[PDB]
Write a protein that holds these residues in place. Structure first.
Motif, short mmCIF file in Angstrom:
data_model
loop_
_atom_site.label_atom_id
_atom_site.label_comp_id
_atom_site.label_asym_id
_atom_site.label_seq_id
_atom_site.Cartn_x
_atom_site.Cartn_y
_atom_site.Cartn_z
N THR A 1 -26.72 -17.54 -7.25
CA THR A 1 -27.85 -16.67 -7.51
C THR A 1 -27.55 -15.66 -8.61
O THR A 1 -28.43 -15.37 -9.44
CB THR A 1 -28.26 -15.93 -6.22
N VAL B 1 -31.69 -21.11 -2.85
CA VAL B 1 -30.89 -21.09 -1.63
C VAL B 1 -29.78 -20.05 -1.79
O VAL B 1 -28.82 -20.27 -2.53
CB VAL B 1 -30.31 -22.47 -1.31
N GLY B 2 -29.92 -18.93 -1.10
CA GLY B 2 -28.93 -17.87 -1.16
C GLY B 2 -28.32 -17.56 0.19
O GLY B 2 -28.16 -18.45 1.02
N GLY C 1 -29.76 -24.14 -6.29
CA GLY C 1 -28.72 -23.15 -6.12
C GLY C 1 -29.16 -21.72 -6.28
O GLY C 1 -28.52 -20.81 -5.74
N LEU D 1 -22.31 -19.74 -2.14
CA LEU D 1 -23.73 -19.47 -1.95
C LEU D 1 -24.17 -18.20 -2.65
O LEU D 1 -25.26 -18.16 -3.22
CB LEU D 1 -24.04 -19.38 -0.45
#
Ligand SMILES: O=C(N[C@H](c1ccccc1)[C@H]1CCCCN1)c1cccc(C(F)(F)F)c1Cl
Ligand SMILES: [Cl-]
Ligand code: NA
Ligand code: NA
Length: 546
Positions: free
Chosen positions: A350, A21-22, A18, A346
């Motif tokens: 981050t 993956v942005g 997580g 998404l």
């Protein structure tokens, strides 16, 4: 003593998935694939991932796990090079300030999409112009006018702030509240949340992909995506764009990985997790490209054009292009809702690290039990300081400052930090001791393929990226707007606030190390300090201490 650990390997893997993956796997990769070769871009993509993506990830993960310290306490191998660590916190500050302002155009659009009629469908609102020509009217699309004339009233200069946009200050308040409330305990709190905001985007992507596939005219949109143009792979530009995308997307040299791996147990397999995460991150970009290009092909078919006029790079795709295509589907306020929820999720996986990276440092560097009983107060102290510092970006001239901070601040300071840190652990500390250190953790010597890729190939690839970024530098331009000289100067000074922390701290350290000759002063402060090793006395055996 009470630092704590993850508890489950699944928690660590999901958190890293997580975090890596942005938003860069949704709007960046498909356009690059379409432009630079088509289906022949995957050969440079997957050749420069094996030799540059996996070794760096593995080295960072093994560096973090050995000494159970954050991004600032692991620099005991060479105390003079600690300026690298302070360089990892300045950059992570910038990406922590302007990333939450992007969360308005995912939150504001999500909150404005709960209507029986999409507000950006028809061109009859009072804020429109004479060029409202669209597709759904019973050339200027009616989603660009909504984007640049009602959501944010763009001005004509970067230094032309006119007023703060209150609907955006609202998202910033809500988003910082959510970020703080999701990190109220840290490892024991975020580790149970990543079970949700790491997997739901895959469900949303599957649903959207199914809808796109059964949609008429989609097979013509996927043919342009992956049809091979083998001529392109004979150029050096394509090999220079497949090396920067791998480096930036994986999240290298922002910290984070060195502070995620600091909570793992000592005897943890750092080789399997270094491959699983790397492959998972690079196997999502292809799926996102399929999902985007199916609907883009439907859109192009509806307007009866080749798929070259309806392709956009960044915020012009997720907010001006894709929403303008979802309005043709029967039940549009549901697909739009799911898409913007996926974008929010998404972008929120981050930001958890970019707040925990700065807290772990300030906690461990000070050193106390008083700083551990009140970690939540520290976490609140950084959240309220990232909300006041992100108010000028929500004004009328917010987009201008948004693109100047992602193209100068965190553009080439990351490449310099990684190159110096590679030299620091390989040729200053010694590549013959790090292998034994890794063997102490993994239980077997590193694969021979990783010893030749950690000393010759990967630093060469980093040097190639550094050289290619200089020969192809152009002044930043937004549409037809040309940035003035002072904006470029401010951006350059911003880029010099991270790579200039290494020489200054080195001079400060060697100005107080006791010695006789400068070569002897350099000889000291470059050897491991007498605190380098496992943090638990049960693991220290053999070479590292009796
Ligand atoms: O997503 C963006 N850049 C990513 C990035 C990663 C890491 C650091 C900085 C930037 C890319 C950089 C290139 C390689 C793949 N990752 C982006 C693009 C255009 C506009 C904006 C805006 F407007 F939101 F600032 C953004 Cl944020
Ligand atoms: Cl990517
Ligand atoms: Na993400
Ligand atoms: Na990314």
């Amino acid at each position: 003593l009470k630092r704590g650990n993850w508890g489950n390997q699944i928690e660590f893997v999901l958190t890293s998935v997580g975090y890596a993956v942005g938003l860069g796997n949704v709007w960046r990769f498909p356009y690059l694939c379409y432009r630079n070769g088509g289906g022949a871009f995957m050969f440079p993509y997957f050749i420069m991932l094996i030799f540059c993506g996996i070794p760096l990830f593995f080295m960072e993960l093994s560096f973090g796990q050995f000494a159970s310290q954050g991004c600032l306490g692991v620099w005991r191998i060479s105390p003079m090079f600690k300026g690298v660590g302070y360089g990892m916190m300045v950059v992570s500050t910038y990406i922590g300030i302007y990333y939450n302002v992007v969360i308005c155009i995912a939150f504001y659009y999500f909150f404005s999409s709960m209507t029986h009629v999409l507000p950006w469908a028809y061109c009859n609102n009072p804020w429109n112009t004479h060029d409202c020509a669209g597709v759904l009217d019973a050339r200027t699309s009616p989603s660009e006018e909504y984007w640049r004339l009602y959501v944010l009233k763009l001005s004509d200069d970067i230094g032309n702030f006119g007023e703060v946009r209150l609907p955006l200050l609202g998202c910033l308040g809500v988003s910082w509240l959510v970020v703080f409330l999701c990190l109220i305990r840290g490892v024991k709190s975020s580790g149970k949340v990543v079970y949700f905001t790491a997997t739901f985007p895959y469900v949303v992507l599957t649903i959207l992909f199914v809808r796109g596939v059964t949609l008429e005219g989609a097979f013509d949109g996927i043919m342009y995506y992956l049809t091979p143009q083998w001529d392109k792979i004979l150029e050096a530009k394509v090999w220079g764009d497949a090396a920067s995308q791998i480096f930036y997307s994986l999240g290298c040299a922002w910290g984070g990985l060195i502070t995620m791996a600091s909570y793992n147990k000592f005897h943890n397999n750092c080789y399997r997790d270094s491959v699983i995460i790397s492959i998972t991150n690079c196997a999502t970009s292809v799926y996102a490209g399929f999902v985007i290009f199916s609907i883009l092909g439907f859109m192009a078919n509806h307007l009866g054009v080749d798929v070259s006029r309806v392709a956009d790079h960044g915020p012009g795709l997720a907010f001006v292009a894709y929403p303008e295509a979802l309005t043709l589907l029967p039940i549009s306020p549901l697909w739009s809702l799911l898409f913007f929820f996926m974008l929010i999720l998404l972008g929120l996986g981050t930001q958890f690290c970019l707040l925990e990276t700065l807290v772990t440092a300030i906690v461990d560097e000070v050193g106390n039990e008083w700083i551990l009983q009140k970690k939540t107060y520290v976490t609140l102290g950084v959240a309220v300081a990232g909300f006041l510092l992100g108010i000028p970006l929500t004004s009328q001239a917010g987009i201008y400052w948004l693109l100047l901070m992602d193209n100068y601040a965190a553009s080439f300071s990351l490449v310099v930090i990684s190159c110096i840190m590679c030299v620091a652990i390989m040729y200053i500390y010694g590549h013959r001791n790090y292998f034994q250190d890794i063997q102490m953790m993994l239980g077997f010597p590193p694969p021979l393929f990783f010893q030749i890729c950690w000393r010759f190939v990967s630093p060469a690839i980093i040097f190639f990226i550094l050289v290619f970024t200089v020969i192809q530098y152009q002044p930043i331009t937004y549409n037809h707007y040309q940035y003035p000289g002072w904006a470029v100067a401010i951006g350059f000074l911003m880029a010099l606030s991270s790579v200039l922390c290494i020489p200054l701290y080195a001079m400060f350290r060697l100005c107080r190390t006791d010695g006789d000759t400068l070569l002897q002063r350099l000889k000291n402060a470059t050897k491991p300090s007498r605190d380098w090793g496992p943090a638990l006395l049960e693991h220290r055996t053999g070479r590292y201490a009796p």
